[PDB]
Amino acid sequence: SGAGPTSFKTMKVIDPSDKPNVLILGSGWGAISFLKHIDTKKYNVSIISPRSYFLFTPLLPSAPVGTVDEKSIIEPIVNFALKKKGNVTYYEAEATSINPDRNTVTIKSLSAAEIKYDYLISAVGAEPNTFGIPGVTDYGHFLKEIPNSLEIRRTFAANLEKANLLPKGDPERRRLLSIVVVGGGPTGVEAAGELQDYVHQDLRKFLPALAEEVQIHLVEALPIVLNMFEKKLSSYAQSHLENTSIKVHLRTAVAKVEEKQLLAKTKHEDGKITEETIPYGTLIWATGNKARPVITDLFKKIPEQNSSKRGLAVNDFLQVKGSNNIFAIGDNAFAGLPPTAQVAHQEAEYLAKNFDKMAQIPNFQKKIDLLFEENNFKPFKYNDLGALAYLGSERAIATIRSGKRTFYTGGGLMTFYLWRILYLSMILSARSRLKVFFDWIKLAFFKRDFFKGL
Amino acid sequence: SGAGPTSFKTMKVIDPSDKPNVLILGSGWGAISFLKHIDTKKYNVSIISPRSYFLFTPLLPSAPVGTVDEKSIIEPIVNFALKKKGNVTYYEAEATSINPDRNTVTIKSLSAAEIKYDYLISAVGAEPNTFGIPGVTDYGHFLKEIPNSLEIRRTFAANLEKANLLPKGDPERRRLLSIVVVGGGPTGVEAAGELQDYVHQDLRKFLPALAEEVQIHLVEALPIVLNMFEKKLSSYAQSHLENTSIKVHLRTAVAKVEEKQLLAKTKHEDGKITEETIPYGTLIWATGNKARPVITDLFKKIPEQNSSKRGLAVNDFLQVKGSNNIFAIGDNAFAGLPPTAQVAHQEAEYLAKNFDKMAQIPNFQKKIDLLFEENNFKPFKYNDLGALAYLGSERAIATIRSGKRTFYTGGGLMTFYLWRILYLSMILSARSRLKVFFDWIKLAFFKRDFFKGL
Ligand SMILES: Cc1cc2nc3c(=O)[nH]c(=O)nc-3n(C[C@H](O)[C@H](O)[C@H](O)COP(=O)(O)OP(=O)(O)OC[C@H]3O[C@@H](n4cnc5c(N)ncnc54)[C@H](O)[C@@H]3O)c2cc1C
Ligand SMILES: Cc1cc2nc3c(=O)[nH]c(=O)nc-3n(C[C@H](O)[C@H](O)[C@H](O)COP(=O)(O)OP(=O)(O)OC[C@H]3O[C@@H](n4cnc5c(N)ncnc54)[C@H](O)[C@@H]3O)c2cc1C
Ligand SMILES: C/C=C(C)/C=C\C=C/[C@H](OC)[C@@H](C)[C@@H](OC)[C@@H](C)CCc1oc2c(O)c(OC)cc(OC)c2c(=O)c1C
Ligand SMILES: C/C=C(C)/C=C\C=C/[C@H](OC)[C@@H](C)[C@@H](OC)[C@@H](C)CCc1oc2c(O)c(OC)cc(OC)c2c(=O)c1C
Ligand SMILES: C\C=C(C)/C=C/C=C\[C@H](OC)[C@@H](C)[C@@H](OC)[C@@H](C)CCc1oc2c(O)c(OC)cc(OC)c2c(=O)c1C
Ligand SMILES: C\C=C(C)/C=C/C=C\[C@H](OC)[C@@H](C)[C@@H](OC)[C@@H](C)CCc1oc2c(O)c(OC)cc(OC)c2c(=O)c1C
Ligand SMILES: [Mg+2]
Ligand SMILES: [Mg+2]
Ligand SMILES: [Mg+2]
Ligand SMILES: [Mg+2]
Ligand SMILES: [Mg+2]
Ligand SMILES: [Mg+2]
Ligand SMILES: [Mg+2]
Ligand SMILES: [Mg+2]
C-alpha cells in the first residue's frame, strides 16, 4: 500500500489465514493499551496511525520548558509490537474514510489504498476544539502532540529574546512576556504551572528583570478550575495558582484572538458582563475536545450515529451503535464517561479480554449485541480510580479511590511526591520510565534545558 | 551593536574604565578554557562567537546515533560566564575582519559594528578541509558541530527507510546501506565505531535483514589509522575495526565524490595504484583542518603572517608573530603542536595565568615579546598527557603519560571503561557530566534513540 516509511510487519512467526483480521486505528492510549492486551495469536492484528510512537500525554505539559525532554515521554510503536507473540502490522497513515458497507478503511499517507478488516477498533482520539472562535488557529498553539511542545518553546524563547531588546517600561516588552493559557482542566493548569516554574526557578536566575515582568494568565469559562475534583481541592488549586502570580480568569470566555491581543468576556457572579482586551505574546489553547473528520464522516454512514456529536455512541460492550463489527474506545467514543487516559486504558483492557472470549465462540470467528448477551459477557463498568493535577511550585492535588471508597484526598508537597510516583508507575514502557526519572533527578540539581533549536 | 538575540552582559558588579579590554574570539575549547581561568576583575572580558554554547567535541561522534544526546554534550556560555566574579559580555556574531591597525574586530550576525580591544585572544578554531576534492560539500557531511550530528542522523535514517522498501538483492538497497567515513584519526574512527555499534547492537534487534546488509567503510590516506598512538595500538585498532566488519581502506585518497558513488585511489605498499568506485548512501568527511576566512584574511595584514598557511604563527608566549596585542590559541594557532582539545586547554590555562601576572606590571596596563622576556615570564611548554580513542564494540585504546613517563598504555575492555571515566572527568560542566552519565546508564539497559525528527 501507500503507507509511510515507518510502516512495518513484525515476523515472530511465519504467517500462512483462519484468524479474524483486527484493525486498530490510532497509536495512543486506547490503541496501545489494546495492543498490549490483545492476543496476536488469536487474531491478525494491524494498526493504522500517522504517529509511529506512543505519547505519554500526562507529562506533555512538562515538555515545552524541559521539565522532561520530548524523547522521554514517547515510545516507538514497534517496541510494543515486538513484545507480542504473533505478528503485528503497522501502516504509517491516517484513516480518511471508514467504510462499514465493505469492511475497509481508506488510508492516506502524509509521507506516502483500502485496508480490510473483520473487526475494527477505532481509537483515533479527538482534536482540540476552537469553538469557531476567530483567530485561535492563526495565532494560538494547541498542546496535544510533540510538535506543539517544540512550537511553544520556539515561540516563548523568541518572545523572551525580543522582549530583552526593549527598555524596562515598553508596553511591547510587557506584551511579549505575557502568556495566556485557555482551559482550566489539568492540561491548561499544568501548562501554566510548568511555565511559571521555568520562569521563577530557572529564567529568574540568569534574566531576573525579564522573569519578573512575565505574566501568565489562565482563562476558564466555568466558575472553577479542575471541576473533576472535590470543591476544596479546586479551591486549594486556584488559591495556589494565584499565590504563584498566575492571574486566573474564571467565568471567562475568549470571544476572539487577534495577533497581539485577545478579547476575554467575563460573566461575573453578580450577573454583569465585562470585556477585557488582554495583550499576549504566547497563546496556549488547552480546552475542548471535538470529533475528528474521519469520525464525523462515519456519523453520516450509520443511522444510529446520525445524531452523534461528541463521538461515536457505543453500547455496554463498546460496539459502535448500529455496527456488528466496529468498536470504539477513548476520546472518539461516547460512553457517558470523561475523555481521559484512565477511561481509554480501562476500555482497552476490557475489550481485549472480550476478544479472548470471542475466539472461543464459533459465531464470532466467521441486534448487534445479541451474541455478547446470549453468551453472558459482562458489560463494561468503568472504575473511577481518582484524579491527579500538578499546580506548579512543587504542589499537586490528588484524589485516589476505587469503587465507593476514597483511599486518599489532598494537596501539598507530599501530594506532589505522590503525583510523581504515580505518574512513573503509569508510564507504559520501562525506557520512558527511566528517562523521565533521570529528567527529574537532573532537575533537582540543574536548570531545565530550554533550547529553541533542540 | 548588531549582534544576535542570545547576546548578553552579565551584571555581577556595577561597571564604572581603568582595566584593559580583553576580547575573546570563539566559544570552544580555547575560548571557554580561557574564560574559566581569566580574572574578570583584572580585565573587562568580552566574547564574540556565533555559537552560544560550548561543545564537548570528543563525544560529538557519539551523538548522531544517540549513544549520547546532543543536549548532553553542550553547555550555554552564559552558565560559564555566571561563575565569574566580574562582568562578561557575549556578542552572538562571527568575527568577519580582525583590524590590527585600529584594534577592532568587525562582526556580522547571522541573526542580527566594530568591537574595540586592548588585547585580542583568537580561538575561532579551524574548519574541515575538503582539499578541493570535487563533490565533498555537495554530497558529504562534516562532523564538527551539533547541526552535523542532526544531519547525519536524518540522512542515515532516510536511507534505511528507502532501503527497507527495496528487495534483498537490489544494488540500490546495498548502496543506500553503505556508509563511507573519510579520516582515520579519532573523529573518523569513532564515527565509524559508533555507527557500527548502532547497526549491530540496536538496528539488528528490530531490522536484522537491513542491519546485516549495512557496510561501513573507513578511508584514510596514511598507511595506518590513529598515527598519534604507538604502532602496536594502531595495529590493534585496525584489527578490531576490521573484526567488527568495517572495511578499512588505508593508503587511499578520495579523488572525487559523486551523488551515488565516490572514486577512491589506493597507492598500495607494492607501488601499484588502483581505483575503486565505492557506491555510498552516507558520506561523513572527518579529516583535515584548514584556516577560516577571518584568519586567512589576517595573514595578509601582518607581514610576519604573510607566509602562514595552517594557522596564525605564535611565539613562546602565544602572541601572534608581528602583533603586540593579539594572541592565538587552539586550532587557529600554529605553535608546532597537534590540533587537539588537550593543546587548546593547556594553551588557554597558560595564557590566563600570564594575564594575571600582566596586571601586576604597569607597561602591560597602558620586539613584541620584550616585556615578557624582561619580566622573566616562562615560555609555554606543552605537556603531552597522552591520547584516547573509542573503536566501537566496547573497545578503546589509551596512552596515559606526563613528561617522559608513560603511566598506562593499552587496549581492550578495561581501556573502554577507562576511556569513559576519563572523558567524564574532562567535561567542563557538572550538568553536561551528569547528562552524559545518564545517557550511558540508559544505554546499558535500552536501545539508543535514533529519531529523525528529534
Ligand atoms: C496535554 C494533555 C495532558 C493530559 N493529561 C491527562 C491526565 O493527566 N490524566 C488523564 O486521565 N488524561 C489526560 N489527558 C487525556 C488523555 O490523553 C486522553 O483522554 C487520551 O489520549 C485518550 O486516548 P485515545 O486513544 O482516545 O486518544 P490519543 O491518546 O489522543 O490517541 C489518538 C491516536 O490516534 C492517532 N490518529 C489521529 N488521527 C488519526 C487517523 N485519521 N487515523 C488513524 N490514527 C489517527 C493519533 O496520532 C494518536 O496516536 C491529557 C491530554 C492532553 C492533550
Ligand atoms: C568530532 C570531533 C572529535 C574530537 N575529539 C577530540 C579528542 O577526543 N581529543 C582531542 O584532543 N581533540 C579532539 N578534537 C579536536 C578538538 O575539538 C579541537 O582541537 C579543539 O576544538 C580546538 O579548540 P579551539 O578552541 O581551537 O576550536 P573549537 O573548539 O572548534 O572552537 C572554535 C570556536 O570558534 C567559533 N567560531 C567559528 N568561526 C568564528 C568567527 N568568525 N568568529 C568568532 N567565533 C567563531 C566556533 O563557533 C567555536 O565556538 C575533536 C574534534 C572534532 C571535530
Ligand atoms: C482495589 C483497587 C483496584 C481494583 C484498582 C486500582 C487500585 C489502586 C491504584 O494504584 C495502585 C489506583 C489507586 C491508582 O492507579 C490506578 C490511581 C491513582 C489511578 C489514578 C489514575 O490512574 C490512571 C491510570 O491507571 C492510567 O492507566 C494507564 C492512566 C491514567 O491517565 C493519566 C491514570 C490517571 O490519570 C489517574 C489519575
Ligand atoms: C604528573 C601529572 C600532571 C603534571 C598532569 C596530569 C596527570 C594525570 C591526568 O589525569 C589525572 C592525565 C593522565 C589525564 O588527564 C589529564 C590524561 C589521560 C589526559 C589525556 C587527555 O586529556 C585531555 C584533557 O586533559 C583535556 O582537558 C580538557 C582535554 C582533552 O581533549 C579530549 C584531553 C584529551 O583528549 C586527552 C586524551
Ligand atoms: C536509609 C535508606 C534509603 C534507601 C534512603 C534513601 C533516600 C533518598 C532516595 O534516594 C536514594 C529517593 C529516591 C527518595 O527519597 C528522597 C524519594 C523516592 C522519596 C520521594 C520523593 O522525595 C523527594 C525529595 O525528598 C526531595 O527532596 C529535596 C525532592 C524531590 O523531588 C523534587 C522528591 C521527589 O520527587 C520524590 C518522589
Ligand atoms: C560493593 C560496593 C560498591 C560501591 C559496588 C558498585 C558496583 C557498580 C557501580 O554501580 C553502583 C558502577 C558505577 C561501577 O561498577 C560497574 C563502574 C563505575 C565501574 C566501571 C565501569 O564498569 C562497567 C561495567 O561493569 C559494565 O558491566 C556490565 C558496563 C559498563 O558500561 C558498558 C561499565 C562502565 O562503563 C564502567 C565505566
Ligand atoms: Mg489511540
Ligand atoms: Mg495522544
Ligand atoms: Mg479514541
Ligand atoms: Mg485524544
Ligand atoms: Mg574556542
Ligand atoms: Mg568545537
Ligand atoms: Mg583556535
Ligand atoms: Mg576547531
Tab-separated table of N, CA and C and ligand atoms in Angstrom, chain A residues 27-29 51 53-57 60 124-126 144-145 292 331, ligand 8:
chain	number	residue	atom	x	y	z
A	27	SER	N	-2.522	5.223	17.663
A	27	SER	CA	-1.340	4.759	18.408
A	27	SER	C	-1.178	5.521	19.737
A	28	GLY	N	-2.306	5.744	20.397
A	28	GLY	CA	-2.379	6.467	21.660
A	28	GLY	C	-2.843	5.572	22.787
A	29	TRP	N	-3.471	6.174	23.793
A	29	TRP	CA	-3.872	5.441	24.994
A	29	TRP	C	-4.756	4.221	24.711
A	51	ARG	N	1.159	8.536	13.516
A	51	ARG	CA	2.186	8.752	14.524
A	51	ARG	C	2.817	7.409	14.896
A	53	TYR	N	4.736	6.425	17.213
A	53	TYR	CA	5.081	6.268	18.619
A	53	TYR	C	3.878	6.550	19.521
A	54	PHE	N	3.942	6.010	20.734
A	54	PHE	CA	3.007	6.316	21.808
A	54	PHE	C	3.461	7.587	22.526
A	55	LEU	N	2.507	8.432	22.914
A	55	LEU	CA	2.780	9.641	23.689
A	55	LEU	C	2.169	9.515	25.083
A	56	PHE	N	3.007	9.626	26.111
A	56	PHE	CA	2.528	9.682	27.488
A	56	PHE	C	2.011	11.095	27.751
A	57	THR	N	0.754	11.309	27.375
A	57	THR	CA	0.135	12.638	27.391
A	57	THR	C	0.167	13.365	28.742
A	60	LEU	N	3.062	15.693	28.824
A	60	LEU	CA	3.280	16.627	27.717
A	60	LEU	C	3.391	18.091	28.177
A	124	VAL	N	-8.822	6.844	17.393
A	124	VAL	CA	-8.130	7.995	16.792
A	124	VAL	C	-8.133	9.245	17.683
A	125	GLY	N	-8.852	9.185	18.797
A	125	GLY	CA	-8.899	10.274	19.760
A	125	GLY	C	-9.758	11.405	19.234
A	126	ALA	N	-9.519	12.599	19.754
A	126	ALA	CA	-10.261	13.796	19.399
A	126	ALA	C	-9.247	14.899	19.162
A	144	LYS	N	-1.103	19.205	22.487
A	144	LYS	CA	-1.739	17.941	22.127
A	144	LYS	C	-0.724	16.892	21.653
A	145	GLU	N	0.289	17.321	20.901
A	145	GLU	CA	1.263	16.443	20.271
A	145	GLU	C	2.650	17.021	20.497
A	292	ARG	N	-12.925	14.081	15.197
A	292	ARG	CA	-12.099	14.251	14.012
A	292	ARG	C	-12.939	14.011	12.746
A	331	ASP	N	-11.267	8.823	23.460
A	331	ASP	CA	-11.921	10.118	23.214
A	331	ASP	C	-12.822	10.155	21.974
C	8	MG	MG	-2.221	11.272	22.378
